[PDB]
Amino acid sequence: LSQKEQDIQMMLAADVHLGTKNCDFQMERYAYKRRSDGIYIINLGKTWEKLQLAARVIVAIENPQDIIVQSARPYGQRAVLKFAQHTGANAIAGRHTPGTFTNQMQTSFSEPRLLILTDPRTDHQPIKESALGNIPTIAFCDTDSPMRYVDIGIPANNKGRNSIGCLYWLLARMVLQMRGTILPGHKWDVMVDLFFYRD
């Protein structure tokens, strides 16, 4: 099968297309239809293309340390730290310190070239701070995710262990394939299981 076909295979395995009963007005361009009970089904080719664009953005950042991945969620930590471990970016887990991107006198001061987030509605504080330091943002956006101050919103299911793990594993794989780390003639040795949350 094609690479797109394989990735959407994994997305269907991980329920990355399962939306919420509510869909945001700026995310309706990725929701394909609405289930009878109320769930919106995310168009997953759009998800794949957004992931490809995000990867194109990441590999253009020739210093991966200038990238920060954050997850206030509990199911995103493993995924975020493993994504940073494989990609080479920085990973902060749990609470953002209000001031991290603005307070230059804070010890946690950072000036990331790229801010990758997991859920724009649980991670609103770092997005608000990135709106104060010219920081572009990539986010994994659900159907109800607010799109304010989000530059590359990947339409995907956030609430869920498997979805977060699969999305971050795919994004890391794409970044490394574009970087040449994963040689095109070879697959990636890391499974998606290591990106899942451990209870």
Binding site: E5, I8, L12, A13, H17, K33, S36, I41, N43
Partner: peptide
């Protein structure tokens, strides 16, 4: 393998021309 999906999601897959080797109706 054995990806049980409903009618709406299979619609999307079709709209994306997706054979979905393991795509099966949930009934």
């Amino acid at each position: 393998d054995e990806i049980r999906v409903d009618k709406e999601t299979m619609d999307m897959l079709a709209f994306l021309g997706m054979a979905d080797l393991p795509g099966v109706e949930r009934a």
